[PDB]
Amino acid sequence: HMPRFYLPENLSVGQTVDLPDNIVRHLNVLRVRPNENITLFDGKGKAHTARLTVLEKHRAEAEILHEDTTDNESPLNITLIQSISSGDRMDFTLQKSVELGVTAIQPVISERCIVRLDGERAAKRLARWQEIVISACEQSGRNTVPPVLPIIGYREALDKMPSENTKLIMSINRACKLGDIRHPSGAIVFMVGPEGGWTEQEEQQAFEAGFQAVTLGKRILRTETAPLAAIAAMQTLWGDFT
Numbered sequence: 177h178m179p180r181f182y183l184p185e186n187l188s189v190g191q192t193v194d195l196p197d198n199i200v201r202h203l204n205v206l207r208v209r210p211n212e213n214i215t216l217f218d219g220k221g222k223a224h225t226a227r228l229t230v231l232e233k234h235r236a237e238a239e240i241l242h243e244d245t246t247d248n249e250s251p252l253n254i255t256l257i258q259s260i261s262s263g264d265r266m267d268f269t270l271q272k273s274v275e276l277g278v279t280a281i282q283p284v285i286s287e288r289c290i291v292r293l294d295g296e297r298a299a300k301r302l303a304r305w306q307e308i309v310i311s312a313c314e315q316s317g318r319n320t321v322p323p324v325l326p327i328i329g330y331r332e333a334l335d336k337m338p339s340e341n342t343k344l345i346m347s348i349n350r351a352c353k354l355g356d357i358r359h360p361s362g363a364i365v366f367m368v369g370p371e372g373g374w375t376e377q378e379e380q381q382a383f384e385a386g387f388q389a390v391t392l393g394k395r396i397l398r399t400e401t402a403p404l405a406a407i408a409a410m411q412t413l414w415g416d417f418t
Contacts, residue, residue: 178212178213178214178225179203179206179208179214179215180214180215180217180313180314180315180317181195181199181202181203181214181217181314182217182218182219182310182313183195183216183217183218184218184219184220185218186218187218187224187226189224189240189243190239190240191240192229192237192238192239192240193237193238194235194236194237195237195238197234199236200232200234200235200236203228203231203236204231204233208228209228209231210230210231211227211228211229212227212228213225213226213227214226214238215244216238216240217244217319218319219310219313219319220320220321221247221249221319221320222243222319223243223244223246223319224240224241224242224243224244225241225242225243225244226238226239226240244319246317247319248316248317248318248319249277249279249318249320250277250279250411251416252277252279252364252410252411252414252415252416253279253362253363253364254277254278254279254280254363254364254407254410254415255278255279255280255281255282255337255363255366256269256273256278256280256281256282256366256368256403256407257284257365257366257367257368258270258281258282258283258284258368259283259284259285259286259288259330259369259370260289260291260293260301260327261291261370261371261400262291262371265371265399266291266305267308268400268404269368269400269403270308270312270324271308271309271311271312272312272400272404273403274308274309274312274313274316274318275312275316276404276407276411277318277407277411277416278322278407279320280322280323280325281305281309281322281323281324281325282333282336283302283305283324283325283327284329284330284333285327285328285329285330286330286370286378287330287372287375287378288369288370288371288372288373288374288375290370302324306324309321309322309324330378330381331381334381334385337363337365338363339386340361340362341362341364342357342360342361342363342364342365342388343365343386343387344357344364344365344366344367344387344388344389344390345366345367345374345379345382345389345390346367346368346369346389346391346402346403346406347369347379347382347389347390347391348389348391349379349389350379350383350389351389351391352388352389352391353390353391353392354390354391354392354406354413355409357388359414360414364410364414366403366406366407366410367382367387368402368403390406392405392406392409393405
């Protein structure tokens with residue numbers, strides 16, 4: 177119904193405060209007329225209904241009507257560890273994984289990274305990646321915004337999660353099906369490679385870090401579809417798809 181806007185601020189059930197410059201442009205492009213209602217969520221799980229009071233070319237105000245009791249989150253905790261890939265493959269991975277309920281995203285540089293990251297580029301891509309995630313929350317109705325964590329290398333990211341986590345790498349080598357894995361009890365950490373794939377040594381490191389290699393289905397998918405299909409499969413076995 178009501179257009180949704182991410183506003184990382186604490187809102188009081190009766191306070192009228194002025195909206196940031198990014199929400200102003202967003203309101204104007206959607207042609208949202210004054211006295212219509214919008215949704216403001218802080219990305220931490222709490223949203224509010226607000227009545228649009230003012231809207232100008234470079235200013236916006238809103239009044240907080242009431243608090244939305246709205247939780248669309250999957251109870252399953254999935255961190256997608258994704259090797260940096262170029263353009264559409266990365267953007268679609270980031271956008272659709274948010275629609276499918278991923279809880280965090282750890283971009284990593286692996287051996288076969290072909291994305292330029294020197295200078296200011298790494299920060300600029302992270303910020304654009306963060307904005308794609310935010311937009312996907314606005315569209316899919318999530319009031320919790322999964323973080324896009326600072327870029328690190330593959331090796332450093334292996335030692336990050338606690339031992340008790342379910343640690344999965346998409347790979348055809350030393351694999352079982354995702355359904356045939358020991359029933360995960362807590363959080364899931366899921367590792368995906370770039371276009372060029374994993375190196376032989378990279379697989380060994382994951383195997384030594386306790387990662388279980390998983391396949392889904394009889395054909396190996398080379399595209400961003402494989403991590404997306406896997407997260408949906410995870411929501412069906414352990415998340416809010418079942």
